[PDB]
């Protein structure tokens, strides 16, 4: 503790700490490419989305607002961006 690296702390400790508290502050969020069983369009959505995101082709919601991050619509298949 008396001698310790702050310029290069362990990446495990990086994921340990809070956002806004890293060496350089970086968001923990990410984007997703979701496909709805309806059509073949790939929709880009946010992990912590705040709106009932729907595909422009069909009036089917793909996410759902939540106190934290998005909860999907039980049938959409996603890939992390």
């Amino acid at each position: 503790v008396l001698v310790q690296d702050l310029l290069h702390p362990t990446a495990a400790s990086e994921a340990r700490k809070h956002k806004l508290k890293t060496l350089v502050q970086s968001p923990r969020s990410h984007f997703l490419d979701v496909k709805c069983p309806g059509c073949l369009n790939i929709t880009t959505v946010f992990s912590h989305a705040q709106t009932a995101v729907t595909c422009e082709s069909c009036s089917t919601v793909l996410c759902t607002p939540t106190g934290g991050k998005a909860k999907l619509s039980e049938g959409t298949s996603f890939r992390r961006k």
Binding site: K19, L20, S26, P27, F31, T44, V45, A49, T51, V53
Partner: protein
């Protein structure tokens, strides 16, 4: 962690990513993003809702990253900036709502104190927007002006 008008000490916020430039995975066009912003504004949406719509339904991380200008700046360049700034307008709406609740029931003193707090915040924000000359120097806040601006 200041909480200007209360004793709160929270720091819940958002950390802007280090890289200013566009994300590698984004394939959209800056001109198309500007057109989308213009259309959303013409629908009658404030810049914050425009940003939230671009972040949720599309891959726009933030307008300044993609276009190079800010949302309100983009609207102003096209002459769609509202005559009252969005935060001040929302404060006006909240104040008129609490005043309505007050005049519909007198005995509630806590909402009276909250209206005092909201009016103080309105005065501070109006002073700021007045020294920057966004609002005319004669702009001020009294009763029945908040309703006129809101309605």
């Amino acid at each position: 962690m200041g909480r200007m008008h209360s004793k709160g000490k929270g720091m819940s916020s958002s950390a802007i990513p280090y890289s200013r430039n566009a994300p590698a995975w984004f394939k959209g066009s800056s001109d198309g993003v500007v057109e989308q912003i213009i259309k959303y504004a013409r629908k009658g949406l404030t810049p914050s809702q425009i940003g939230v719509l671009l972040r949720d339904a599309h891959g726009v991380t933030q307008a300044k990253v993609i276009t190079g200008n800010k949302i309100l700046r983009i609207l102003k360049s096209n002459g769609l900036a509202p005559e009252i700034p969005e935060d001040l307008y929302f404060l006006i709406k909240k104040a008129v709502s609490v005043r309505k609740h007050l005049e519909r029931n007198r005995k509630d003193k806590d909402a009276k104190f909250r209206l005092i707090l909201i009016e103080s915040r309105i005065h501070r924000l109006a002073r700021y927007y007045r020294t920057v000359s966004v609002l005319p120097p004669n702009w001020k806040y009294e009763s029945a002006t908040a309703s006129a601006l809101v309605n």
